[PDB]
Ligand binder design. Structure first.
Ligand SMILES: Nc1ccn([C@H]2C[C@H](O)[C@@H](COP(=O)(O)NP(=O)(O)OP(=O)(O)O)O2)c(=O)n1
Ligand SMILES: [Mn+2]
Ligand SMILES: [Mn+2]
Length: 379
DNA sequence: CTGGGGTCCT
DNA sequence: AGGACCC
């Protein structure tokens, strides 16, 4: 049976968070910077040619009057992200997160209830909320069109509630599966919404100019396909199943070829509480071991506060480094430390330092470009 | 001048 | 422990 799925992506998420805190940034072009990367920027900046994930120098060069704010601490962004997720969970309990600013909600049950409440007179009165992709004509006698229109109404209610209770704006897309909702949400940006009626699905899927634009096909998979003369959605649709499996494996091939047709049987999973907490630090150089112990101390402090806040306990710790391509060592967290979660710091530092020395030899000079710590295996 | 996070699979 | 993917 056919579902109704909604996808929500927040507008310039980090930048919008910053503009809420410091309204003086509301009308100036704003970029959010982590080290040498303008990770996002408000739409004023995008008018002047700034783009997401530009270099700082490319951003200032394409817009010298750009105002930069540091986004290396994701605390406020994370808080807001979960405020949005909890808000959406009021509508339907089952909400799936995709990173910090995107959410999927399966509206099927809700839509059915709303239709059950309706009589025959108002069925003619049902109207779309927001955009209809490709200006496709609505057939009120088509039940799928009716249900998707109801989904557009619920989506507008969600966006409005996000603005009224969280001051956040974003785009939504309503479709029959997660792939099509996520693809259709970004058609009209920012702070708009689009519904995709079934007849336009193929159109939407062929509007893409390369397969990498499909969620599920990343850099590596895209490269492997590029090497096979596959450059369009149709090249992947029309490629031979057997050859594709032989090159990419069975599961990957079948799934991504199903995606090239706009098909997504995957359900909306409940994300719930985080499966892991982590902190990262990048830098130009780290070669003094006591420097590394200081960085790990710093990461550990914040991680400890966050773990304390959740009220859940991690049963595993990891340490990740990058050498001047990424490597990690993990180990379980001793039970008495877990219970104490007391100067839990010093034992944690000792453990993570033993892992560090397992990874890298202090006797030989070394050059590390990233130190990250992860508390996972939460219970 | 290539961040700082996350998920699940193998 | 690493690898693929997502933002
Ligand atoms: N590679 C990435 C992608 C996103 N992000 C963060 C910064 C973004 O503000 C936030 C949301 O990512 P995004 O939706 O891809 N772009 P953003 O929401 O900023 O603007 P829109 O174009 O979506 O309106 O995740 C990141 O830190 N590193
Ligand atoms: Mn966004
Ligand atoms: Mn996003």
């Amino acid at each position: 049976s056919s579902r109704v799925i909604v996808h929500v992506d927040l507008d310039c998420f980090y930048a919008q968070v910053e503009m809420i805190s410091n309204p003086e940034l509301k009308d100036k072009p704003l970029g959010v910077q982590q080290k040498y990367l303008v990770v996002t920027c408000n739409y004023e900046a995008r008018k002047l040619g700034v783009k997401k994930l530009m270099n700082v120098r490319d951003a200032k060069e394409k817009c010298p009057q750009l105002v930069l704010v540091n986004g290396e601490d994701l605390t406020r962004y994370r808080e807001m992200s979960y405020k949005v997720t909890e808000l959406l969970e009021e509508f339907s309990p089952v909400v799936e997160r995709l990173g910090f600013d995107e959410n999927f909600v399966d509206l099927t049950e809700m839509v059915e209830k709303r239709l059950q409440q309706l009589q025959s007179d108002e069925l003619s009165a049902v109207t779309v909320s927001g955009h209809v992709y490709n200006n496709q004509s609505i057939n009120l006698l088509d039940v799928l069109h009716i249900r998707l229109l109801v989904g557009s109404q619920i989506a507008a209610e969600m966006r409005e509630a996000m603005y009224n209770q969280l001051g956040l704006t974003g785009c939504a897309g309503v479709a029959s599966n997660k792939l099509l909702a996520k693809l259709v949400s970004g058609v009209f940006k920012p702070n708009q919404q689009t519904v995709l009626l079934p007849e336009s699905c193929q159109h939407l899927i062929h509007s893409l100019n390369h397969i990498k634009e499909i969620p599920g096909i990343g850099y590596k998979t895209a490269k492997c396909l590029e090497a096979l003369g596959i450059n369009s959605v149709r090249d992947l649709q029309t490629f031979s199943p057997k050859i594709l499996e032989k090159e990419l494996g069975i599961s990957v091939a079948q799934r991504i070829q199903k995606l090239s047709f706009g098909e997504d049987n995957s359900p909306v999973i409940l994300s719930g509480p985080p499966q892991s907490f982590s902190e990262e630090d990048s830098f130009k150089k780290c070669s003094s071991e006591v420097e590394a112990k200081n960085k790990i101390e710093e990461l550990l402090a914040s991680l400890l506060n966050r773990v304390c806040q959740d009220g859940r306990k991690p049963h595993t710790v990891r340490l990740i480094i990058r050498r001047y391509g990424r490597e990690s060592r993990q180990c379980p967290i001793p039970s008495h430390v877990i219970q104490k979660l007391y100067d839990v710091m010093t034992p944690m530092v000792d453990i993570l330092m033993k892992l560090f020395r397992n990874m890298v030899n202090v006797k030989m000079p070394f050059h590390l470009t990233l130190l990250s710590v992860c508390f996972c295996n939460l219970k």
